[PDB]
């Protein structure tokens, strides 16, 4: 490449990172920043296991 | 000013310094990196006093 500060856009260097994920293939090990609550039972509730 | 990294040439900021100086109108004090030598006498030489 010929990266020079004089060159306009379309030639200035750019940094690129691509992120790829799995889709529920095993016990997931990279979760989100959520707060696990207690464990209720015998009640009509909605869960996020 | 509207300095943005996407701006083309002719709009990116430039740093400028101008140097002015008197042409020996008094005993000068700002010399260069030259080294003073010893003094000789009674011999035809050239000097930079």
Swiss-Prot record, chains A, B:
Disordered, as annotated region: 25-47
The outcome of changing residue 25 to P is:
Increased resistance to human covalescent sera neutralization
Domain of life where this protein originates: Viruses
Impact of changing residue 7 to Y on the protein?
Answer: In strain: Alpha/B.1.1.7, Beta/B.1.351, Gamma/P.1, Theta/P.3, Mu/B.1.621, 19B/501Y, Omicron/BA.1, Omicron/BA.2, Omicron/BA.2.12.1, Omicron/BA.2.75, Omicron/BA.4, Omicron/BA.5, Omicron/BQ.1.1, Omicron/XBB.1.5, Omicron/EG.5.1; May enhance affinity to human ACE2 receptor
Query: How does this protein assemble?
Result: Binds to host ACE2. RBD also interacts with the N-linked glycan on 'Asn-90' of ACE2. Cleavage of S generates a polybasic C-terminal sequence on S1 that binds to host Neuropilin-1 (NRP1) and Neuropilin-2 (NRP2) receptors. Interacts with host integrin alpha-5/beta-1 (ITGA5:ITGB1) and with ACE2 in complex with integrin alpha-5/beta-1 (ITGA5:ITGB1). May interact via cytoplasmic c-terminus with M protein. May interact (via N-terminus) with host bilirubin and biliverdin, thereby preventing antibody binding to the SARS-CoV-2 spike NTD via an allosteric mechanism.
Q: What is the effect of changing residue 2 to S?
A: In strain: Omicron/BA.1
Gene that specifies this protein: S
Which region of the full protein is contained in this chain?
495 to 543 of 1273
Task: Explain what the record says happens when changing residue 7 to T.
Answer: Reduced host ACE2-binding affinity in vitro
What does the protein in this record do?
Answer: Attaches the virion to the cell membrane by interacting with host receptor, initiating the infection. The major receptor is host ACE2. When S2/S2' has been cleaved, binding to the receptor triggers direct fusion at the cell membrane. When S2/S2' has not been cleaved, binding to the receptor results in internalization of the virus by endocytosis using host TFRC and GRM2 and leading to fusion of the virion membrane with the host endosomal membrane. Alternatively, may use NRP1/NRP2 and integrin as entry receptors.
- What is the protein's given name? Spike protein S1
- Impact noted for substituting residue 7 to T: In strain: 19B/501T
């Amino acid at each position: 490449y010929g990266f020079q500060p004089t060159n306009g856009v379309g030639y200035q260097p750019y940094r690129v990172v691509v992120l790829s994920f799995e889709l529920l293939h095993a016990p997931a090990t990279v979760c989100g920043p959520k707060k696990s609550t207690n464990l209720v039972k015998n009640k009509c509730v909605n869960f996020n296991f």
